[PDB]
Subunit: 509 residues, 4 copies
């Protein structure tokens, strides 16, 4: 009855998956904790099982990772880069099948599953070059015969907790960077994407083994809130990268701060698109559609708020309805499907409640609003008009495809309305106005980590630092100098002179 | 009976101080909170009085500061740099009397009082150039017809809480950097250095007023824990910079994390000096003495642990004892004086407490240990031998001139002993060995924020970032790219092309 | 007869100038060369005399500067910055009288003379901060137990040759940066702004001498081509910064290259403004006027070519003509004056030559074209229409206020026309079109070193690197990392390990 | 008769080489110039033939390359990065056979031939990441409502002239960087390594064609001085990267400067090793040996001068002699061989002239000095004692394994003797003294581009910039910000405000 036991899904075995899998890796595979079964959200059929980590598994693994660090930190960064390069190659080799597993277990369409694996491949190739660049300036000291240098060194063990919706790429961003920076990693992924976590870890383990390196450099401990909390409280976890809900991230940030650890928090978003009167509507409508319904509206960067100037509000909404109608719904492995299921049945309940609250708070559902009558967690992509910008439900992050549409008149108020929410991840304006664009990028503009112009809220590449402000948590991943969060700065003064300090009256020697 | 009403202390009037002073500035001067009297640690005499901030004062001031930010943030960074240049000049003009005030109210010797003002002056001149440099890279987008830019913008209001021991320079580091970065500031200094806070604020207010700027850009609200806690919990304080005890700092960090604010923590030190067998003893002995007894052992970077290789241990300890007896003690403002009083009577009590605690834990006092029989809070600079490196009183930070001396044999164990404590601020080795130096600076070396060679634990200049790791709190001030902590990063993608996105099968337009 | 002997010009004495002045400084003042008398171009009267350098003067000065470098290079960069800070303040205290001398002897209006001194003051304050920042990265070596560092050190003697039209700021830019970079300097200014060179050097010399530093750190050797040629041919001149004509710059560059020296060339411009059909005309017209007639069209960055879309050509021309007629002409120290004399009588004749050449090539003078009926070197600001964009006189740099106006139809051809000339200094477009703007800034856009949008060709501040491409010479001054041209990069590997190389079958030791 | 026609050398066909090969590539293969035969330096047998470029081939190729640029410059840098990544992979696939060709045609031993290919592979991988990093800062304008940005854009066509001794890696450094920076390339390699140039170009040509890119993006024009001179004089060659003799390079520099082009010169070396009294002699002797005789003394970074403190001089020379005696001499592809032939018979003749000149100037040959009686261009590795540091022959670069040895006593004189030569490429000291090491690295130390400590003169990796000063030419290749030499800087001010300029008394509109 497991999908992995059906010949139709034999390709799963190309990732080294079996009926029952070990969810702990530290150089050896094991798992003494609870056995979890994960399910395909397109049909709710069981795929396979994973043995999760017990506390003893976690203890053993942290210790092994920290012993492996002693070897790893001694390897020159460029040589660490070479390992990361080989990891990218090993992912390249498995990209289609790993992409298919992401579609199967998580629920996003295949091109996005493959695309997410390509994202990890790309950050590896990036990190290879960065591994030859990381460090700090030699500075001119004000003291004669002294050197002043800024050094960067690994923090040690980087704990990585990731969410269901990007079960490969977020880990990848943290892993490739943390690795070239001389850290070891311990991964705890979302329980409902356990097979994906195991499959990626099998790919990396083989590269470490072929290079005769301890596997615990990239440790895995599958588990849920129990293991996540242990990492948050563990002094041996020097940096904890956490991607997930704002509510959980807040508690993780507190626990880390309590022990003077470091945390990197990538939390929820309430991302807005603003369309000004002068905007190219041929650009706005498709941009809005794909940002809003992409991944069934389950991206951290999903467009959840659409502000449209009064003069064009009715036309844009009309064109958006006409476009939603053409969204192709199906299984996420079905070719040319644009739109798959929500990740859990719970997310469907959150969807419905949201649509109910919207209707009751005075909103009108101009499209969607219903559960589709079919197997799996499918809901109609939804557009809601008529709500006030400060409506309770619109300030809430609901991880479903519901787009709240508002009218505005002036630039200052709608910039304010962008900024008024608790989250601070991504934002976008559509306009041709040179002046407005630079105000939006300036000190009185968007308050978000991602501030886009004529591209929707999901526009982001690995070259820049990725992350948000406010309740989004403040962490950055991937590009620019995000690498610094994974290392510790020292300011080092070196007296190379035979000079003595002033005696100040005192008779020395 | 107030020192400011005696002719010998008439110079205080040059700083704009009188018998009773307003301790709130927000464009106007005020203060409706409790009136505090500050005392000269050299003779335990009252100097003058300061009216502190009430809750209402605090509320009004935060509001005015945030209103002034609307103006200040619109002022181009280099023009903001020009104001900071003028603050530097106003400081130059008062450097002698302000330096004297620092000696009088805080109790450090006059050249360090003056030296501290010079520090503020120096960061001003530095920030001037920086104000034409702050920003991020334009990066190459992977997308045709798109630009990708990293922007930096002010966070808004920077709350600055400072300690008694550096009552001018810490605020200055924060102030000059936060100012050129486009933020307004709110200062709450240590209550026992209130006159210093008022005097500095009077200098800055005159520059702001003279430039027709709202004075609230550099606001002051004198108070103790109640105002500090208010700032820690205040969502309107976008970044809180805190310098003070690890115990208080931990609670401030938690309160700020609870509200997803930003904190910059500069906390305790337990700094070690390590002398290897090949060290230049003629460099070691004076370096150790000055970093141990400087400012009566009340610097954050004070040398409190001294590791000496066993072959040279007794010779270093004997020479240090002979050097300690030549320390010139007296009034801080008196010339040739090297050693003044502790800041408070409580500090003296802590001093005695620690000395008895060390004897109880098996320590031997080889010099000092007692209170001096004279006016003021004077205690003997103290040397203790025989403790184990992991003695509890050795791991505890006592803000008193006590130096714990330990033997070691080999490099790996003593690097580990440097790193074994909860604090992570400063560290120094004295050695000639080229290999040892680069291992000290490396991943298996010192874990401190400041890592020095052949210069003691107070070695640090403007050009580098200043701060520590672990329970020191992780913040950085002054140099390198510490400015980034006072600003928010946005990653901005601009589509300037007429290219429409892929329709993906949908019929738009 | 000499202006300096007339009571109305007694203010010249405040700069330390007399009837006959020493034009050589190297710690001592002297000059055994040709005596030159400089003239006011506003009334063609002699101002005062300068004794120029003989060959023996130049020889002695080079040797003294290079001796002085031994001391100067040993001063830590931040302390070099303090000298430059003090130079900044010394210029501040003399800014009005110095700016007045620039107006007197060179002929630009008072606000530009004063402004040029402010420019030197500003780069000083910039350089002070930079002096704590210059240097390179510490990079991660691929070899275990090795450090890899990029060091920067002074080149030695920086020869600086400057032009008549910016007799203070160009030197100032080079001086401030070279100085904090640990170089010594040798200045040869234009013979016709000799008093300005002597006055600037008197101010710097006092600062150096007051700091008990050898004056030859900032040497002056006034002279013409013979002194300049000697600098170009002199191996002891490690870097030669040349600002002047393309014709001479080419020969200077070749001579320096012949001896494998370093050159920094800032040569001519043929700068264009392009106004597209969507441009804000109320921005275009005054931008063009002030960029065309400012400094009587004698800036390297002066707008000489004006391209206007066919649809708005006649209107912009008519509005420019109406605006030129209101330009106020007079003595450059009169504050109502926007417009001063040309620098020489030869320049007036060449103005006439170009006008006549333009008419010969088929052009129409729509405004001006004539010498003005008054004492001094005054000509009418001039507009020429109807020339082809590849007319010879339009591709010629004439240092006179003649603006050549062209029609254009489309973007691609007008970008090509901007780029078609030999020079490559500055360029500007006026447009609202987002896409056009980023194409202009991109690879198929302007080929100049300064590339502006909605601001004319004279738009430049100290924060960025200043200079051009192609026949403008390639050098950069002032901002960004222009400082690297004044220093030598070394890539340094330090083996600090006890490891021995592989024996490769050879029995060593 | 041709080696390529022998079955033992059948592997050469794996590089797609045949009896007669086309030596021009621009998307098409051709060559109407003279047919050159290249010879194995180890036995002087002909290998195969290459048809070189006529003038017509060159002209057409430059035009096709510049056409190709219009497409290439429009490709986003990260995507150009992806092409370079694939080039690295294609090189990987042929690393053994390509390396074997390098040993065969050029004559360096196998591990270095393969090593050279690996070098190109590594810079490709580095360039991949850099292609998402290149660009400049956004800077804070002093002007309200203005943006100030530094842009970097390709120069266009980069001509690359390379030398015999590194027939793969030097081109690869230039190629990988130039390509990600958006330039197209035109390669003219040394005529005596033509088969190598063709073999490399075949590999790249396939990658471009598989990606449907025009092949002229990486163009090849095989030829001698006539094609090189043409490139130096050609205004269409925007940057000329020249690697080769100081003699030729001087003329290339002058030709490029004459037309105001850009040049990047990598010229001769006269590299010193300096052994101080405290040096690790087990470290010094093999470091000296391998750096002196490596690649038969034919590296630009080859150690040619050895300075030894008088106290250890005879000991090191004796130990060096005994080690030279054990150098294994033979065919460069032979696995056990350390030492192969010089590249040409002319090189053997120059070697002989240098040895005879060293004797006539009073040197003593204490090891080697003779041509070896065997097939090929073999000479004995040679050591010469007794010359003064300023002997003419020692100041001369003879591209042969001749090591000039000198005594010295003190640091100051020996730093000067390192610096006194015209060349400025690489330098090394061996010492343990901390003070000496940082002095060496400072302003009074080595004047070379590579400045090493306890590692020989050939110590360099791709992470840092590679090149030298003085007569070595000034150019840098590979790491750090060397990429900037392949691009043009623009400083761009964007006025996005509605603000009009001040009227200054003029009535507009």
């Amino acid at each position: 009855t497991l999908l992995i036991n059906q010949p139709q899904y034999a390709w799963l075995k190309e990732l080294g998956l079996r009926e029952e899998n070990e969810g702990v890796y530290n150089g050896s595979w094991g798992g003494r904790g609870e056995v979890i079964t994960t399910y395909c959200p397109a049909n709710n059929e069981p795929i396979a099982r994973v043995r999760q980590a017990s506390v003893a598994d976690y203890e053993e693994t942290v210790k092994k990772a920290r012993e492996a660090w002693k070897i790893w930190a001694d390897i020159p960064a460029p040589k660490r880069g070479e390992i990361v390069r080989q990891i990218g190659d090993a992912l390249r080799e498995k990209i289609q099948v790993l992409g298919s597993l992401v579609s199967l277990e998580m629920g996003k369409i295949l091109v996005e599953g493959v695309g997410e694996v390509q994202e990890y491949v790309d950050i590896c190739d990036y990190a290879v070059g960065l591994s030859r660049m990381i460090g700090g300036p030699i500075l001119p000291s004000e003291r004669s015969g002294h050197a002043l240098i800024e050094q960067w060194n690994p923090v040690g063990l980087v704990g990585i907790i990731t969410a269901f919706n990007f079960p490969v790429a977020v880990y990848g961003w943290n892993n490739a960077i943390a690795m070239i920076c001389g850290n070891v990693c311990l991964w705890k992924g979302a329980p409902t994407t356990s097979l994906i976590s195991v499959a990626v870890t099998k790919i990396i383990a083989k590269v470490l083994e072929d290079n005769k390196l301890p596997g615990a450099i990239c440790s895995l401990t599958c588990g849920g809130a129990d293991i996540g909390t242990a990492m948050a409280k563990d002094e041996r976890v020097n940096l904890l990268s956490f991607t997930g809900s704002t509510q959980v991230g807040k508690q993780v940030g507190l626990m880390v701060q309590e022990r003077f650890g470091r945390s990197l928090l990538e939390l929820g978003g309430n991302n807005a698109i603003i369309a000004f009167e002068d905007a190219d509507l041929s650009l706005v409508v498709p941009s809005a559609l794909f940002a809003a319904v992409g991944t069934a509206g389950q991206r951290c960067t999903t467009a959840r708020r659409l502000f449209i100037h009064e003069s064009i509000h009715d036309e844009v909404v009309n064109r958006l309805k006409k476009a939603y109608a053409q969204i192709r719904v199906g299984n996420p492995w079905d070719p040319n499907v644009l739109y798959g299921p929500l990740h859990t049945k719970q997310a469907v309940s959150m969807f419905l409640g949201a649509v109910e609250e919207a209707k009751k708070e005075g909103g009108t559902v101009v499209y969607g609003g219903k559960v589709m009558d079919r197997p799996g967690n499918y809901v109609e992509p939804t557009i809601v008009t008529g709500l006030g910008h400060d409506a309770s439900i619109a300030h809430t992050e609901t991880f479903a495809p519901i787009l709240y549409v508002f009218k505005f008149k002036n630039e200052e108020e709608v910039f304010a309305w962008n900024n008024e929410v608790k989250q601070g991840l991504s934002s976008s304006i559509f306009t041709k106005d040179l002046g407005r664009i630079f105000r939006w990028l300036g000190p009185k503009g968007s308050d978000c980590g991602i501030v886009n112009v004529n591209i929707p809220t999901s526009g982001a590449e690995i070259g820049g630092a990725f992350g948000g402000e406010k309740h989004t948590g403040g962490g950055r991943e991937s590009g620019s100098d995000a690498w610094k969060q994974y290392m510790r700065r020292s300011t080092c003064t070196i007296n190379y002179s035979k000079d003595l300090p002033l005696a100040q009256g005192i008779k020395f020697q």
